[PDB]
Amino acid sequence: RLPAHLRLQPIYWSRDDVAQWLKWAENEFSLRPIDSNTFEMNGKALLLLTKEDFRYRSPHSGDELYELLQHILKQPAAGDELKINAACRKVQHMVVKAALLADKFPVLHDIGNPKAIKCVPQADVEWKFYDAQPCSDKAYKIEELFYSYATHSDKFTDGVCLFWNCNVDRYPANSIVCRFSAFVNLKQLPFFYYSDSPCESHVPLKSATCITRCNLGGAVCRHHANEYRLYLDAYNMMISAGFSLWVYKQFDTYNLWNTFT
Ligand SMILES: N#Cc1cn([C@@H]2O[C@H](CSCC[C@H](N)C(=O)O)[C@@H](O)[C@H]2O)c2ncnc(N)c12
Ligand SMILES: [Zn+2]
């Protein structure tokens, strides 16, 4: 089974997630009561312990807890589709909005979008929609096109191209890509969080990937710390599901920091 708050792979587990795992296994298997701090570590460290270490920490259930973890590793749980759907929209909005602010593309070519929906409606950019099979109710504002690099590598050179879960043979250089040799023109997109929303004072967040105005001095406000952690869960939930993010090579996070001056 699964408790719906341990659905990600154990490598993504936090210290509190491990405590929930011990408490969940205490009732699911009628194990003897065990203190939460018996395994005071994150999931990334719990995977480095030996089975002998489990017995030393928990003489009554250490061997049972170890074998339970192995089956979790051998058979990863499936994430909820709606939560994965929400995670994909949140990451898509974050990445595209940041890219448009960083490099100020005059036009966006959304390739693979059959519903003519902008993920960044306030972007102030010419939004173009392309799809091989446009929806009937949106085809009037969608160009019917099947993208192939051998056919269109000389097209859509202006602005940026968006291939969000649009698996094509090879992406052009000016691309923003999510996918579940084709990325030779691109680079991997590292994790980051960007927010231009106002700060509000009502655990201190230490991270160089929190691109917020309050983090210029290292003091992330409560509002952006909570939004950062909610986004990180969505990012991890999407990476755990087998999605990878790729971007044009000149993408630079320092362009996002310059938006605060
Ligand atoms: N292979 C391939 C191709 C598949 N698509 C379209 O991309 C979509 C993938 S599902 C929706 C993805 C959307 N960007 C979203 O963010 O939800 C479908 O509508 C499919 O018809 C294509 N379109 C243009 N040229 C192609 N070469 C393909
Ligand atoms: Zn802030």
UniProtKB/Swiss-Prot annotation:
N7-MTase domain mapped to chain residues: 79-261
Record-listed S-adenosyl-L-methionine binding positions: D110, I111, G112, N113, P114, K115, A116
Regulation (activators, inhibitors): Inhibited by Remdesivir antiviral drug (GS-5734).
Positions bound to Zn(2+) 16: C199, C214, C221, H224
Recorded superkingdom: Viruses
Catalytic activity: a 5'-end (5'-triphosphoguanosine)-ribonucleoside in mRNA + S-adenosyl-L-methionine = a 5'-end (N(7)-methyl 5'-triphosphoguanosine)-ribonucleoside in mRNA + S-adenosyl-L-homocysteine
Location relative to the cell: Host cytoplasm; Host endoplasmic reticulum
Assembly information from the UniProt record: Interacts (via N-terminus) with DDX1. Interacts with nsp10.
Function field: Plays a role in viral RNA synthesis through two distinct activities. The N7-guanine methyltransferase activity plays a role in the formation of the cap structure GpppA-RNA. The proofreading exoribonuclease reduces the sensitivity of the virus to RNA mutagens during replication. This activity acts on both ssRNA and dsRNA in a 3'-5' direction.
UniProt-recorded name of the protein: Guanine-N7 methyltransferase nsp14
Organism from which the protein derives: Severe acute respiratory syndrome coronavirus 2
Gene name of the record: rep
Shown part of the complete sequence: 6225 to 6449 of 7096
